[PDB]
Design a binder for this molecule. Structure first.
Ligand SMILES: Nc1nc2c(ncn2[C@@H]2O[C@H](COP(=O)(O)OP(=O)(O)O)[C@@H](O)[C@H]2O)c(=O)[nH]1
Ligand SMILES: [Mg+2]
Length: 241
């Protein structure tokens, strides 16, 4: 029953809730509350759905609920360690990874998304993602990725796998793909049936979800936990000085 917790984050209507169901299988109502969804694979996989952010005209301090949630899991874990009675196995409800959905605009990162990602990246591992990447043509995807990569660097946003931490060669493959071009679907024939052809979501030539999935739960899954435990949680623990 080894545990791994992922949280999806972004504005509403970006296919965030759809990708959650897509990930597990490997109309949905507008998400109004933070909801934790858990199924078993042996791994206990938890995907955390969240209300949209940046939906309002004014969005100051609108990152606080998600920020509260992330910090609440660190706090539960810390209090477990301080407990004198605890515990054969401390339950890990901490957010290990965080998929941040980026609107497939074509231009550049929005100050809104930059502001949010820059805050999240300090307390959790961020993996940027192009929402509804089927929107983009092949040439648009490449150009937009360049702008996102340039913007991430120029705004000092640490995405997983973080640079400061053979392994370097392996990690570049992950970094060259950020932001991941993902497509959501829960129908199978599994793809998204459009007017002109069906998009095969787990087909590497159609989108990049297949890569992200294997990179998140198979090859990097332990390292994401390790960074969560040794960097983010340890930094939280220190702050309680
Ligand atoms: N074009 C496209 N549409 C999608 C994709 N994933 C979901 N959608 C559609 O986007 C709409 C809202 O999706 P939803 O999962 O509720 O987004 P969320 O509210 O941000 O979680 C739905 O009508 C979906 O059918 C995708 O990969 N590509
Ligand atoms: Mg939703």
């Amino acid at each position: 029953g080894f545990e791994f917790n992922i949280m999806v984050v972004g504005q509403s209507g970006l296919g965030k809730s759809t990708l959650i169901n897509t990930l597990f299988k490997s109309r949905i109502p507008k998400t109004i509350e933070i909801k934790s969804i858990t199924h078993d694979i042996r791994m206990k996989l938890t995907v955390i759905d969240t209300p949209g952010f940046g939906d309002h005209i004014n969005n100051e301090n609108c990152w606080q609920p998600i920020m509260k949630f992330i910090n609440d899991q660190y706090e539960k874990y810390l209090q477990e360690e301080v407990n004198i009675n605890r515990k054969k196995r401390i339950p890990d409800t901490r957010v290990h990874c965080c998929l941040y959905f980026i609107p497939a605009t074509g231009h550049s990162l929005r100050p809104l998304d930059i502001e949010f990602m820059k805050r999240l990246s300090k307390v959790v591992n961020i993996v940027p993602v192009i929402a509804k990447a089927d929107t983009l043509t092949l040439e648009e995807r490449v150009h937009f990725k360049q702008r996102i990569t340039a913007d991430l660097l120029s705004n000092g946003i640490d995405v997983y796998p973080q640079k400061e931490f053979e392994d370097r060669l392996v990690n570049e493959k992950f970094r060259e793909m950020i932001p991941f071009a993902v497509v959501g679907s829960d129908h199978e024939y599994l793809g998204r049936k459009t007017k002109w052809g069906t998009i095969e979501v787990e087909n590497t030539t159609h989108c990049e979800f297949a890569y992200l999935r294997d990179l998140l739960i198979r090859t990097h899954m332990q390292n994401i936990k390790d960074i969560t435990s040794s960097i983010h949680f340890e930094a939280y623990r220190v702050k309680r000085l």
